[PDB]
Structures are given as structure tokens and as C-alpha cells.
Design a protein around this ligand. Structure first.
Ligand SMILES: *[C@@H]1O[C@H](CO)[C@@H](O[C@@H]2O[C@H](CO)[C@@H](O)[C@H](O)[C@H]2NC(C)=O)[C@H](O)[C@H]1NC(C)=O
Ligand SMILES: *[C@@H]1O[C@H](CO)[C@@H](O[C@@H]2O[C@H](CO)[C@@H](O)[C@H](O)[C@H]2NC(C)=O)[C@H](O)[C@H]1NC(C)=O
Ligand SMILES: *[C@@H]1O[C@H](CO)[C@@H](O[C@@H]2O[C@H](CO)[C@@H](O)[C@H](O)[C@H]2NC(C)=O)[C@H](O)[C@H]1NC(C)=O
Ligand SMILES: *[C@@H]1O[C@H](CO)[C@@H](O[C@@H]2O[C@H](CO)[C@@H](O)[C@H](O)[C@H]2NC(C)=O)[C@H](O)[C@H]1NC(C)=O
Ligand SMILES: *[C@@H]1O[C@H](CO)[C@@H](O)[C@H](O)[C@H]1NC(C)=O
Ligand SMILES: *[C@@H]1O[C@H](CO)[C@@H](O)[C@H](O)[C@H]1NC(C)=O
Ligand SMILES: *[C@@H]1O[C@H](CO)[C@@H](O)[C@H](O)[C@H]1NC(C)=O
Ligand SMILES: *[C@@H]1O[C@H](CO)[C@@H](O)[C@H](O)[C@H]1NC(C)=O
Ligand SMILES: *[C@@H]1O[C@H](CO)[C@@H](O)[C@H](O)[C@H]1NC(C)=O
Ligand SMILES: [Zn+2]
Lengths: 704, 193
């Protein structure tokens, strides 16, 4: 043993035992507050967290004395590397405080911004609750557009200046930790080293994500073409049969998930899905019974049972006392073998599946509890959720439900219900993949300076049309920040974990169903009573992150790379059905059609000569607003206060050419007819020429 | 006759430090011994409860400790929880039976302040992690010397850095009636009713 190796091992022994005691007290204080929300409990939580954070910072500096090049043991070296990560501490105290001010301002704007009705300024809405209820259930085109544009106009424009300074500060922090940029720093979770044949480079992630998305695209286009056909029934006027989908009609504020579109896209209306909620009520189930069934499922595959302290310390039901709690299902790993679950459990089918998902997190924690303290994690950031998903997949199958008595013994499954079930799965799983891939691609290019600030908004909607097949209902300039209107962007969270978790979960399920000798389509598989499948899963769970994530992946699936073929196998019955439903339709989209292109007027200007700057564009909109006021006052005998914000400009070329259209004040859904705008331009044609000093040849309105 | 006075003299120990009595060449009365308690479970193995009272054996062994009744499922044969792993492993190589009971206030048995059992016992090292120590059938845990200080709160860990050992204890509140567990094993004859 090397002398440096001996000194480092002695240092890590004292740290590991001290950190367990301090981290456990911090978790226990947090648990007491979450199940008992008082001012006194909040004070205790803050004090315990500060003590644990102070200890960690002091020990991190002591770890800087060890040279990782001299350490030969990979386990000791991996612990020291984790303890040497400075993070935000690399910045000077002046800039660290500046970044914290920006981060807190963006989080406060997001959670407290309000959009208000134009007719009644006194009636305002928050994002949650409020606009989220509208965007989930409304089928009113005009009302959905009001909430979509109002959120980005009122809140997104406040975040635009703050996000520009946030990018500069994050790149300065990343370079101080020897990274290319902040996006490169975020991709370090997937870095693997130390074993020959299992190395994974940071730059490999970008190429591998693009390669996997290419094989997903043919399936996503069939789902896109099917949803477009159904939405033409709901919105006959507003949908092009060959173009993109309007962004405000996707069942979500950002269209991250298409789950809420299911009532409008049901393949078979007279074949409802399997809802065992009524059977649980008729058999007098309770919350404790639900978690006992989940425990039986894990024992049948060979996993250990819950500890005695799990049943006494958990909060499985909503308290009936004067105690106020947070009702969000979470699994807690306090330390020292203390495992708890906090859940406000109802007797419903949805809560039955959530109990299996949360106890899967507990099983993962229990498996790697024997690892050193700093190595008690998942293999990478996408492993933990992938384990939780596959448990819910097996518990929801009709074969599993018949074996636990929630379905009759003579229950028969028809293939029309199977298509209903698979279509609902694709609206959540397949639909979110292009959204996740496109968003993280945009942020990566922003951190690399591939996209300048002057083109942030422009590149966002070019990639929406190209990759996602989604078109914006109103044009946006560089005063907007549409990415930042999402929670994960304005709250400084990486997003690629949702893309990789989806791929991992179907690789895991296909491997475990093969170990269970399942014969049939992959979506009908149940791994219950299979101790061979539980042995492969346990070989991966107990590793933690003490080795390369590629080696842990190969223990369960037998390969070291991401693969989307198991995902394509899971949705094969739906893929065959979709190609028959889209036989007479168009598959694919064109990126030129837009909801506002039919009422736009083309403007061509040849100055050569003053530069056509942003100030000259502001003057043009005011001149158009002036012409609209005069036309309404003279030809229609109406007084309408048209302003420069009622003029919408799109497709601005480096040469002087663009399009514009006019909307009515207070109403972004009321577009003025193009014929009436032409009459307005014709009436004041002479004065517009005098404003810009350009005759009919230098400045021309096409179509007039 | 076999004397059970040492049972009633002092408080029963905890499960990881169970007391053992061995009887040879004496007359025993199991009916009188168990008549003093409210028996809640009499699960027997390789013998009948009626045949165990009136048999003749060469040796008789009794293991007893304080045990809360709501943890009864964790003492059953084939369990893989922490009770069997680190505290007490029953030896089924001979006919043995397990009795759970409550002590009425009429019986004069001092009772402890609380119930304590170990949740884990292991050796630690930064090179590889934690190596658990599992209790053998009929034998004591190697982490016994680390419980002498006691446990003040649940999930407290008592360490010894010289030999790199750690033990964690879990506490349950003392009940109104002291609850105990008896494990009786026999071998085949000088001990008869
Ligand atoms: C919820 O929190 C309150 C407030 O901390 C707890 O009330 C405390 O109870 C202890 C005894 O358990 C008293 O000594 C404290 O003085 C109480 N605090 C206050 C501020 O009055 C309450 O026990 C907690 N409830 C549960 C179920 O744990
Ligand atoms: C796993 O196997 C067990 C048996 O080991 C199955 O439970 C049995 O179910 C049958 C009906 O199919 C009952 O007649 C038996 O009494 C049950 N046995 C026990 C011990 O409960 C269980 O259904 C299987 N789980 C699956 C298929 O998910
Ligand atoms: C469900 O299965 C039925 C048969 O049980 C399918 O009905 C057949 O459909 C094919 C074309 O796909 C026809 O050639 C056959 O004549 C049909 N058979 C009958 C008896 O009508 C049905 O298409 C399947 N449905 C789905 C959604 O998969
Ligand atoms: C385990 O229990 C034994 C029971 O004999 C303890 O030993 C006795 O401890 C008492 C404490 O009041 C002393 O009065 C006796 O003299 C001890 N007897 C013997 C033979 O040593 C023992 O201390 C317990 N061990 C632990 C670690 O708690
Ligand atoms: C370790 O840090 C100490 C305290 O800052 C310093 O005195 C010493 O030179 C350092 N040694 C090495 C090997 O870096
Ligand atoms: C580190 O050393 C320990 C103790 O000899 C050994 O068991 C372990 O395999 C070593 N780790 C690696 C990664 O080689
Ligand atoms: C906006 O115009 C539409 C028709 O284009 C009209 O139905 C609606 O009432 C208007 N909005 C408001 C808030 O008045
Ligand atoms: C055992 O004790 C009981 C107490 O009721 C008594 O009736 C019985 O006769 C005793 N048996 C012997 C063999 O002493
Ligand atoms: C025995 O217990 C019973 C029931 O509580 C009680 O009435 C009786 O007085 C007790 N006898 C003695 C001697 O303590
Ligand atoms: Zn989860």
C-alpha cells in the first residue's frame, strides 16, 4: 500500500462515520417539518442543514491535498474525486452572491407571476392553480390562446434579461472547474472511466442522443399524424392537414406531455380501460393493505421485505389531527438503515401504482446501503426513476390484477382495449421524447455560444417546427424568453435525465421479461414470481455508483450502450395500427405554414440609405397603428386605440423584407381582416411614403 | 425439581443478550411455568405442544428475553429481517418451540425501561464499504461489547475505531404489561415431569 493511499484511507474513514451522523440529523429534521409544518420545526430544519453543510465544506478543502494521479485504488480515488468537486465555490464571493441574487429572482417571478383578463383587470390567475386548469381541460381556441400568450408576455419577458446574465455567470463557474462550458459541466454525470472497455466520454452523449432520436422519429410521425386528424374535428378552422400543430392546443402550457389530449383522441370510445378502483372499494381495501400488496410483489421476485421501522415511522395516510403536511409521494433514505415513505394514499387505482413506484425507490436504497457513504447513489442520474417505472408496468397488467383478485377469474381481454391502453401510453412516453431532446439541444448550443443572444428566440421556433412539428400561434421577437417559461429552465435543472430514463426503463423491462420466460407481446409482461429476474436486477442495484454506469447497465441488459429497440418493440402493436389509420392521411409536416400566414401582408423595401435598425421597425408599427386608427375613424365611424403592440412582424430577412398583420386592442385572437388592412394602407399611402422618405418603388406593399 | 427462580429475580435482558437456562437431572412442570402468563403464541416445530409437556429428554434449554408482541412475525422460521440476522437465530436442528407471552401485574418480574434490538452490525473500511456480521444459530452477536454503553435514541450507532466495528440500535417504548419470548429446545433421558 502506498503511503499516500494509507493517509487518504485514514482520512476517508473518519469522514464517512462523521458524515453519516450529521447527514442523518439533517434528514430527520427535514422529515419532522414535512409531516408537521410549524414555525418551530422550520427553525430546527434550518439549523441542522447548516451544520451539515458547514462540515462538508471544511472537509472538501482538506481533500484537496490529495493528488488523484497518485491514488491507485479506484474505490478510494472515486470517493476523493466526489469530495473534491467545488461546484459554485470556484467563483469569487462577489460573483457568487451576484449569481444567487439572479437565481432567487427567477424562482420568485415564476412562482408568483399572474396573467389577468383584458375585460376585467381585477381578475387574475397564477400558473398553479389557474392557467394549468385551463390548458388541461379547455377546448376553447380563443381562451387557450389567451392563457398561452399571456403567460409568455407577462412572465417570460421579465426572465429574458435575467437569463442572459445567468448564462454568463454559469459559464464562468464552469471554466473555473476546468470545463468547456456549463452544458459540458452538466454532461459530466455520464462520464465513465477507470475500466478498459467501459469508458464513456462526455462528448459521446451528444452523438448518442442524436442517433437514438433518429430511430424514434418514424414512430413519432405516425402519432403526430393521428393526433392531427383528431384535432381537426375539434378545431376544423384552425388546423392544416399537412402542417405543424399549434403550440397552444397540446393539452399542456408547454406541450411537454400529450396526456390531456386522450379524451379527444380515443381509438375506441365504447371500450373503457381497466379501472379496478371500484373493486378495491367493494373489497374494503385500505392504505395499509395497498402497501402490503406491494411488499408481496417484491418478495415474490426475491427482494427483501420492509424493515420493522418502515411500518411504524412512515406516513401512509393523511393525518386526522390538526397536523398540516405536504401531500407529495416521496421515498426517504435518512441513513443508518432508516427508510420511510410519505404519501397521502387514497383507495384508487392510481395510488395503487404509485405505491409500487415509491417502494421501488426504497428497494434501490436498501441494496446499495453497504457501499461507502459517498457512493450511495444510482448508477447515473437516470437509473433511479427507471427502476421505479418498471415496477408500475408489471403491477398494472391484467394478469397481475387477476392474480391478486382485483379482476374476475373469467375476465377476458379484447384487442380494442389493448389499443386504447397503448395509445394512452404513447401520449405520455413517446410524445415527450422530441420535447425533451429539442429543449436540451437548445440549451447546449446556448452555453457553447453556437446561438448568439440576437437569435435566441428565432432558433427556438425554428427547432420547434423542425424537430417537434409544433408551430407558434403568434410571432415572437427577442424580447421574449420562451424556454425560460418552463420550470426546469428558470429553476436551474438539467433536463436530459428524462430522455435517458425513458430509454433505460424499456431496456430493463425487455431484459427482465426474457429472464421471466415471457411469451407474447412485451406490454403484457409480469415479472411476478420470477427469482431469476430479481437476481439480475439485484446485481445492478447493489453497485450504487462505485463503478462505471456502463458496467452496471450490462449486468441487467447485457449491453453497454443505450438502445431504443426495446422501446420500439413495446409499441409495435400500436405502430401497426397507426399505419392503417393514416393510410389516406399525410404523414409528416411542412415548416412553412403558420396560423397567421393567411392574413399577413408582405412588405419589400429597397433603401439603397439608412440602416434598418430596431428603432426604424418601431416607427413602422406606429405608422401602421396610425393608419388603422384613421381608417376606423373615417370609414367605420369607430374609435379604436391601435398601438404599436397591435402590429405583429414576422420573417424579417437581412434584406429589408418581412410580413405583418394587425390584431384588435385587448384581443390577441381578433385578427383584423386582410382586406380591411389593405384599405387602411391604401387610404394613408401618401403619408407613409413621407414618413420613411421612400416612394412607391422603394417601399411597396405586395398585393396592394 | 428444576428451578425457574432466576427468571423472576431480575429484569429480563434484551434479545441480543438473551439469557439461557439448561436443566439436567431434575423434574420439570411446564404447565405451572406457563400458567403464570397470558400466552399469545405457542408455535411448535417437530413436536406437539401436548407432547412437549409430558416428554422425557436428556437435556432441556430455555432462552428468554424481553420482546414486544407486535414484532411476532419477525421471529418466524425463514425470516430474513434484522431480528433473525443480527439478534437471535433459532436453531431448528433439534425439536424446539417458541412461546410469546405477557406478564400480569400479579407476577413479580421487574421490567426494563424500553425494548432494544440491533438493526445492523458490521465492520467498516473505506476500501470496500461495510461487511455485515450475521448471528449464528444459538450463539451471540459479535457486536455485543458495543451495546454496553446503551442507546439513547433510535438508529444510534456505537463505534470502535480500533477494530473498525459499528452497531445500530432501535428503541421501542415500554408497554403497560411486560412482554417476553421463550424459546425451549430439547435433546434426547434424565429430565422428566
Ligand atoms: C407537531 O409539532 C408540534 C410543535 O413542535 C409538537 O408539539 C410539541 O410537543 C412536544 C411534546 O411532544 C412539547 O414538548 C412541545 O412543547 C410542543 N411544541 C409546541 C410548539 O407546542 C407536536 O407534538 C408535533 N406533533 C406530532 C404528532 O409529532
Ligand atoms: C405467485 O405464485 C403464488 C403461489 O406461490 C400464487 O398465489 C396462488 O394463487 C393461486 C391461484 O392462482 C391460489 O389458489 C393459491 O392459494 C395462491 N397461493 C398462495 C401461497 O397465496 C400467485 O398468484 C402468483 N403470483 C402471480 C402469478 O403474480
Ligand atoms: C382485433 O381482432 C379482430 C379479430 O379477432 C380483428 O378483426 C379482423 O380484422 C381483420 C383486418 O385487420 C379482418 O380481415 C378480419 O375479417 C377481422 N375479423 C373479424 C372476425 O371481424 C380486428 O381488426 C382487431 N382489432 C384491432 C384494433 O387490432
Ligand atoms: C448481558 O446480560 C448479562 C446477564 O448475566 C449481563 O451480565 C450481568 O450484568 C449484571 C448487570 O446488573 C451484573 O449484575 C451481573 O453480575 C452480570 N453477570 C455476569 C455473569 O457478568 C451482561 O452485562 C449483559 N451484557 C451487556 C453487553 O449488556
Ligand atoms: C496540504 O495543505 C497544507 C495546509 O494548507 C499545506 O500546509 C501543505 O503544504 C499541503 N500539502 C500538500 C502535499 O499539498
Ligand atoms: C482497493 O483495495 C482493497 C483492499 O485491498 C481491495 O479489496 C479492492 O479491490 C481495491 N479496489 C480496486 C478498485 O482495485
Ligand atoms: C376576442 O374576439 C373574439 C372573436 O374573435 C370574441 O369572441 C371574444 O369575445 C373577444 N375577446 C374578449 C375578451 O372580448
Ligand atoms: C404441575 O403443576 C400443576 C399446576 O396446576 C399441577 O396440577 C400438576 O399436578 C403438576 N404436575 C406435577 C407432575 O407436579
Ligand atoms: C391477581 O390479579 C387479579 C386481576 O387483576 C386481581 O384482582 C387480584 O387481586 C390479583 N391478586 C394478587 C394476589 O395480586
Ligand atoms: Zn420516482
Amino acid at each position: 500500500q502506498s503511503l499516500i493511499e494509507e493517509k487518504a484511507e485514514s482520512f476517508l474513514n473518519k469522514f464517512n462515520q462523521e458524515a453519516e451522523d450529521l447527514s442523518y440529523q439533517s434528514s430527520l429534521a427535514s422529515w419532522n417539518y414535512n409531516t408537521n409544518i410549524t414555525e418551530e420545526n422550520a427553525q430546527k430544519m434550518n439549523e441542522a442543514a447548516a451544520k451539515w453543510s458547514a462540515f462538508y465544506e471544511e472537509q472538501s478543502k482538506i481533500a484537496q491535498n490529495f493528488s488523484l494521479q497518485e491514488i491507485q485504488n479506484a474505490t478510494i480515488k472515486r470517493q476523493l474525486k466526489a469530495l473534491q468537486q467545488s461546484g459554485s465555490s470556484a467563483l469569487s464571493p462577489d460573483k457568487n452572491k451576484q449569481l444567487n441574487t439572479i437565481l432567487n429572482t427567477m424562482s420568485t417571478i415564476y412562482s408568483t407571476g399572474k396573467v389577468c383578463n383584458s375585460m376585467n383587470p381585477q381578475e387574475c390567475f397564477l400558473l398553479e392553480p389557474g392557467l394549468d386548469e385551463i390548458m388541461a381541460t379547455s377546448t376553447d381556441y380563443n381562451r387557450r390562446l389567451w392563457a398561452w400568450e399571456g403567460w409568455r408576455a407577462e412572465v417570460g419577458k421579465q426572465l429574458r434579461p435575467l437569463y442572459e446574465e445567468y448564462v454568463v455567470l454559469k459559464n464562468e463557474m464552469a471554466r473555473a472547474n476546468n470545463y468547456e462550458d456549463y452544458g459540458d459541466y452538466w454532461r459530466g454525470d455520464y462520464e465513465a472511466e477507470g475500466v478498459e472497455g467501459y469508458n464513456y466520454n462526455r462528448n459521446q452523449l451528444i452523438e448518442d442522443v442524436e442517433n437514438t432520436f433518429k430511430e424514434i422519429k418514424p414512430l413519432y410521425e405516425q402519432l403526430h399524424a393521428y393526433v392531427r386528424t383528431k384535432l381537426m374535428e375539434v378545431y376544423p378552422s384552425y388546423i392544416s392537414p399537412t402542417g405543424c400543430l399549434p403550440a397552444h392546443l397540446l393539452g399542456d402550457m408547454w406541450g411537454r406531455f400529450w396526456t390531456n389530449l386522450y379524451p379527444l383522441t380515443t381509438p375506441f370510445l365504447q371500450k373503457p380501460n381497466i379501472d379496478v378502483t371500484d373493486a378495491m372499494v367493494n373489497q374494503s381495501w385500505d392504505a395499509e393493505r395497498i402497501f402490503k400488496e406491494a411488499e408481496k410483489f417484491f418478495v415474490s421476485v426475491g427482494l427483501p421485505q420492509m424493515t420493522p421501522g418502515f411500518w411504524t415511522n412512515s406516513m401512509l395516510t393523511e393525518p386526522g389531527d390538526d397536523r398540516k403536511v405536504v401531500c407529495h409521494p416521496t421515498a426517504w433514505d435518512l441513513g443508518h438503515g432508516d427508510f420511510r415513505i410519505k404519501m397521502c394514499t387514497k383507495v384508487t387505482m392510481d395510488n395503487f401504482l404509485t405505491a409500487h413506484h415509491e417502494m421501488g425507490h426504497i428497494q434501490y436504497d436498501m441494496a446499495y446501503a453497504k457501499q461507502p457513504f459517498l457512493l450511495r447513489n444510482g448508477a447515473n442520474e437516470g437509473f433511479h426513476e427507471a427502476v421505479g417505472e418498471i415496477m408500475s408496468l408489471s403491477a398494472a397488467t391484467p394478469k397481475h390484477l387477476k392474480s391478486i383478485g382485483l379482476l374476475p377469474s373469467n375476465f377476458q381481454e379484447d384487442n380494442e382495449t389493448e389499443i386504447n391502453f397503448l395509445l394512452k401510453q404513447a401520449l405520455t412516453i413517446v410524445g415527450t421524447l422530441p420535447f425533451t431532446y429539442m429543449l436540451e439541444k437548445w440549451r447546449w448550443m446556448v452555453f457553447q455560444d453556437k446561438i448568439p443572444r440576437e437569435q435566441w428566440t428565432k432558433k427556438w421556433w425554428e427547432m420547434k417546427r423542425e424537430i417537434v412539428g409544433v408551430v407558434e400561434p403568434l410571432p415572437h421577437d427577442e424580447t421574449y424568453c420562451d424556454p425560460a417559461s418552463l420550470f426546469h429552465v428558470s429553476n436551474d435543472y438539467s433536463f436530459i435525465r428524462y430522455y435517458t430514463r425513458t430509454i433505460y426503463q424499456f431496456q430493463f423491462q425487455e431484459a427482465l421479461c426474457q429472464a421471466a420466460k415471457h411469451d407474447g407481446p412485451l406490454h403484457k409482461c409480469d415479472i411476478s414470481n420470477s427469482t431469476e429476474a430479481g437476481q439480475k436486477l439485484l446485481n445492478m442495484l447493489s453497485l450504487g455508483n462505485s463503478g462505471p454506469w456502463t458496467l452496471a447497465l450490462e449486468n441487467v441488459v447485457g449491453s453497454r450502450n443505450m438502445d431504443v429497440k426495446p422501446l420500439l418493440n413495446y409499441f409495435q402493436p400500436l405502430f401497426v395500427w397507426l399505419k392503417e389509420q393514416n393510410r389516406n392521411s399525410t404523414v409528416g409536416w411542412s415548416t412553412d405554414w403558420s396560423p397567421y400566414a393567411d392574413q399577413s401582408i408582405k412588405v419589400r423595401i429597397s433603401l439603397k440609405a439608412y440602416e434598418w435598425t430596431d428603432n426604424e421597425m418601431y416607427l413602422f408599427r406606429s405608422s401602421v397603428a396610425y393608419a388603422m386608427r384613421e381608417y376606423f375613424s373615417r370609414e367605420k365611424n369607430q374609435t379604436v386605440p391601435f398601438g404599436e403592440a397591435d402590429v405583429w412582424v414576422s420573417d424579417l430577412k437581412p434584406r429589408v423584407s418581412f410580413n405583418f398583420f394587425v390584431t384588435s386592442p385587448k384581443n390577441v385572437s381578433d385578427i383584423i381582416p386582410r382586406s380591411e388592412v389593405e384599405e387602411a394602407i391604401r387610404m394613408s399611402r401618401g403619408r407613409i411614403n413621407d414618413i420613411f422618405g421612400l416612394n412607391d418603388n422603394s417601399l411597396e406593399f405586395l398585393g396592394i | 425439581e428444576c428451578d425457574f427462580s432466576k427468571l423472576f429475580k431480575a429484569a429480563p435482558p434484551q434479545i441480543y443478550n438473551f439469557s439461557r437456562l439448561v436443566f439436567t437431572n431434575c423434574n420439570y412442570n411446564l404447565t405451572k411455568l406457563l400458567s403464570l402468563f397470558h400466552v399469545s403464541e405457542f408455535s411448535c416445530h417437530q413436536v406437539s405442544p401436548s407432547a412437549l409437556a409430558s416428554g422425557c429428554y436428556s437435556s432441556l434449554t430455555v432462552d428468554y428475553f424481553a420482546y414486544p408482541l407486535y414484532l411476532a412475525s419477525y421471529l418466524q422460521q425463514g425470516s430474513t429481517g434484522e431480528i433473525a440476522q443480527y439478534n437471535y437465530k433459532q436453531d431448528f436442528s433439534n425439536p424446539t418451540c417458541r412461546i410469546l407471552a405477557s406478564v400480569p401485574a400479579n407476577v413479580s418480574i421487574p421490567k426494563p425501561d424500553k425494548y432494544i434490538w440491533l438493526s445492523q452490525c458490521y465492520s467498516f473500511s473505506a476500501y470496500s464499504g461495510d461487511v455485515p456480521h450475521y448471528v449464528l444459530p444459538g450463539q451471540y452477536t459479535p457486536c455485543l461489547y458495543l451495546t454496553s454503553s446503551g442507546f439513547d435514541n433510535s438508529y444510534q450507532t456505537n463505534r470502535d475505531f480500533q477494530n473498525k466495528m459499528a452497531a445500530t440500535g432501535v428503541i421501542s417504548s415500554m408497554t403497560d404489561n411486560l412482554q417476553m419470548a421463550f424459546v425451549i429446545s430439547v435433546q434426547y433421558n434424565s429430565v422428566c415431569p
